Every structure is written in structure tokens, then in C-alpha cells.
């Protein structure tokens, strides 16, 4: 009758991931890399990508890494919500559109996948990507 339910996951990226197909980490030149979000202000255009690598058990019973995925989070949100903009950390890269305000984006926050689908991550036409990334 009463089907169990856990605490909600409220911490997902609003956007789909950028999959790393090659050997190069994600990186963006200064001023590039913030995904398109038409429901945001110029003040809002700042955050980080965080690498996540999924592992699966192969046929041999041994663990294999899949292609790394890089997920975008607005500044002050997500798994590294505490970090100030530009805090270097392995697996983190920082991006900001010129004019963004260096303040946490609590008014955007993160996504509950049970309630909202991810937005396809789109970048402005002309954005530079490293080899191994496509958008």
C-alpha cells in the first residue's frame, strides 16, 4: 500500500553534461563557457563545471571508467556551493560571462530530477571547445 520514498535529490545540475570523449580536460577561455539560459539575467552568468566519472563492472568482473561527464552549476550552488569563484580544485573549472556579478545564485539553485528534466546544454555559436568535446 505505502510505497517507500526517500529524501529528494535537490542537487542536480539544471543542464545536461558535456561528455569528454578525448584525453583533454574541459577548459574555456576567459569569458566563454556559460550555458545558455534565457530565464537568467546578465548578473547570473557565472559558475563552474564539475567532472563526474561513472564506473561500471565489465564482463571480467573488473571496474572500467566510462567517459567523464562535466556538469555546470551556477556559482554558490551545487556540490561545490561553498567555493568562491576561481578556487582551483581538481575536476573543477570556473567560467564567467563578462558583466556577471560575483555572488551566489541561490535564486536559481539546483534541480530535483523527479520534478524537472535537464535543459540541453547549449553554448553560444562560436564557443571554443577542447578536442574531444562536441556541442
Q: d(Cα 135, Cα 121) in Å, to the nearest integer?
A: 8
Task: Return the residue matching grid coordinates 540541453.
Answer: 120
Q: d(Cα 95, Cα 73) in Å, to the nearest integer?
A: 10
Distances in whole angstroms, Cα of residue 69 to Cα of each of 48, 92, 131: 13, 12, 14
Q: d(Cα 43, Cα 98) in Å, to the nearest integer?
A: 9
- Parallel, antiparallel or unpaired: strands 18-19 and 69-74: antiparallel
Determination approach: X-ray
CB neighbour burial string for 29-41, b if at least 16 within 10 angstroms, e if fewer: eeebbbbebeeee
* Residue 69 labelled as part of a binding site: yes
Q: d(Cα 102, Cα 117) in Å, to the nearest integer?
A: 27
> 72: Cβ–Cβ under 8 A, 6 or more apart, which residues?
13, 14, 15, 18, 34, 35, 47, 48, 49, 95, 121
Distances in whole angstroms, Cα of residue 17 to Cα of each of 12, 36, 50: 11, 13, 10
Q: d(Cα 108, Cα 46) in Å, to the nearest integer?
A: 12
Amino acid at each position: 500500500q505505502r510505497r517507500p520514498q526517500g529524501l529528494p535529490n535537490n542537487t542536480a545540475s539544471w543542464f545536461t553534461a558535456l561528455t569528454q570523449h578525448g584525453k583533454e580536460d574541459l577548459k574555456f577561455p576567459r569569458g566563454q563557457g556559460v550555458p545558455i539560459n534565457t530565464n537568467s539575467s546578465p548578473d547570473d552568468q557565472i559558475g563552474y563545471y564539475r567532472r563526474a566519472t561513472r564506473r561500471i563492472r565489465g564482463g571480467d568482473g573488473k571496474m572500467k571508467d566510462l567517459s567523464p561527464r562535466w556538469y555546470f552549476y551556477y556559482l554558490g550552488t551545487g556540490p561545490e556551493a561553498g567555493l568562491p569563484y576561481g578556487a582551483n580544485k581538481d575536476g573543477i573549472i570556473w567560467v564567467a560571462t563578462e558583466g556577471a556579478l560575483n555572488t551566489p545564485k541561490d535564486h536559481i539553485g539546483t534541480r530535483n530530477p523527479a520534478n524537472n528534466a535537464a535543459i540541453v546544454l547549449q553554448l553560444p555559436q562560436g564557443t571554443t571547445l577542447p578536442k574531444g568535446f562536441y556541442a
